[PDB]
Amino acid sequence: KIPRGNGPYSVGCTDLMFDHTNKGTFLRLYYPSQLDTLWIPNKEYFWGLSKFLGTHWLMGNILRLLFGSMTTPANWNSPLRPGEKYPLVVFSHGLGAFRTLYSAIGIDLASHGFIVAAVEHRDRSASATYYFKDQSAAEIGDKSWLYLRTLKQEEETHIRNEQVRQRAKECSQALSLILDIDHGKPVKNALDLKFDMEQLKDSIDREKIAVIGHSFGGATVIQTLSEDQRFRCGIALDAWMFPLGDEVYSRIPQPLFFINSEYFQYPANIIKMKKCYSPDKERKMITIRGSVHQNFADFTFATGKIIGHMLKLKGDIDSNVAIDLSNKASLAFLQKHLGLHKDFDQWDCLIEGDDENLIPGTNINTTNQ
Numbered sequence: 458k459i460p461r462g463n464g465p466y467s468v469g470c471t472d473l474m475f476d477h478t479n480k481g482t483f484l485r486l487y488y489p490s491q492l493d494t495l496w497i498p499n500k501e502y503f504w505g506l507s508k509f510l511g512t513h514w515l516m517g518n519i520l521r522l523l524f525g526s527m528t529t530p531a532n533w534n535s536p537l538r539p540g541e542k543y544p545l546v547v548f549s550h551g552l553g554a555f556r557t558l559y560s561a562i563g564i565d566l567a568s569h570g571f572i573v574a575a576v577e578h579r580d581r582s583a584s585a586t587y588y589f590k591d592q593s594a595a596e597i598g599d600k601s602w603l604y605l606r607t608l609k610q611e612e613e614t615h616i617r618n619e620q621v622r623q624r625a626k627e628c629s630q631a632l633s634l635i636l637d638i639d640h641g642k643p644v645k646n647a648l649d650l651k652f653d654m655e656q657l658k659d660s661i662d663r664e665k666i667a668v669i670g671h672s673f674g675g676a677t678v679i680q681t682l683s684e685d686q687r688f689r690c691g692i693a694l695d696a697w698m699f700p701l702g703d704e705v706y707s708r709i710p711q712p713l714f715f716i717n718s719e720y721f722q723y724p725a726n727i728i729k730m731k732k733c734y735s736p737d738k739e740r741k742m743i744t745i746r747g748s749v750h751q752n753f754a755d756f757t758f759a760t761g762k763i764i765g766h767m768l769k770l771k772g773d774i775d776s777n778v779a780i781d782l783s784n785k786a787s788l789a790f791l792q793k794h795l796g797l798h799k800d801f802d803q804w805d806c807l808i809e810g811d812d813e814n815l816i817p818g819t820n821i822n823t824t825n826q
């Protein structure tokens with residue numbers, strides 16, 4: 458029940474791991490293709506989700522039975538659509554998520570002509586992820602799993618900041634890998650999938666790179682922008698600003714778009730967003746009325762209305778309407794600041810919060826002094 462992309466391009470999906478260690482890059486790629494992709498491809502992700510939610514062994518298996526064969530609307534290993542160079546989005550997941558849980562966003566961007574690299578972070582913020590201990594292990598698919606670390610309260614400030622720095626490093630590394638493939642670097646996918654990465658040679662518009670992320674990933678957008686001038690702009694979906702150091706807020710040259718849910722936000726968090734503002738920098742913010750934190754992630758589509766509200770997976774707003782607004786506003790912002798030659802400027806009003814379901818900026822107030 459994950460919505461198909463609303464753009465005119467058909468969408469393909471594949472996975473890339475290189476190198477095979479936990480210091481290598483692991484991403485899911487959504488791309489314009491020339492609808493059978495497994496949404497959550499391994500049992501360990503469900504076990505990891507169960508740990509994240511604070512439940513035991515049995516819950517893991519329950520989630521697996523429920524969602525284990527569910528797909529997402531992208532053609533698995535379909536050939537890349539040839540003939541044109543695509544803008545690139547690197548996408549960062551929230552705490553307790555992993556690379557496949559933002560396919561509603563990834564697939565919609567791909568359907569509008571983007572290549573999207575959804576990274577899987579190895580900072581121990583993912584519910585689960587894996588790597589291979591050596592080439593031999595990779596060759597027989599012998600995975601080594603890393604589960605989410607839970608932190609003591611005294612540890613939080615320090616570790617979350619180290620994690621967001623590791624996350625920014627992984628977004629940059631993912632960018633570097635894709636740009637190297639674009640220029641013909643041979644890569645041996647540690648996964649042995651029927652998609653040839655040589656397809657990506659000369660397929661990237663190297664001047665049109667953006668970073669997008671949700672929650673922890675929203676902080677990662679800001680840290681990545683600050684560290685990596687190759688990214689041209691950023692969109693932070695309901696950013697959780699806590700992991701960032703005080704020094705970073707004034708060190709974001711690139712245009713930045715905050716798209717917030719209504720019920721997630723709170724003054725301490727909003728204050729840090731406003732610290733990113735400067736008269737000489739491009740900043741936009743909107744809030745989606747009635748939305749909750751999880752409106753940006755795929756489990757907002759995975760259940761019925763009533764159980765969804767109980768689990769805080771759904772807000773007062775409809776999940777399709779909310780992701781539509783976010784995606785369309787994102788496309789307009791990307792067109793404006795990547796210099797895209799598309800018709801996304803039809804949604805320019807959404808950047809300004811000009812819609813019944815949008816608030817310009819935020820309803821939360823904070824000191825300006």
Ligand SMILES: CC(=O)Nc1ccc(S(=O)(=O)Nc2ccc(Oc3ccc4ccccc4c3)c(C#N)c2)cc1
Pocket residue numbers: 506509510520550551552553554558671672673750751754755756757768770
């Ligand atoms: C209390 C708390 O920290 N909360 C929290 C913090 C961060 C996030 S996140 O950034 O969206 N990261 C994130 C983490 C896990 C995710 O899968 C879920 C989420 C909730 C579930 C509830 C019932 C059954 C299955 C579920 C599976 C999804 C998704 N989509 C996204 C989500 C919730």
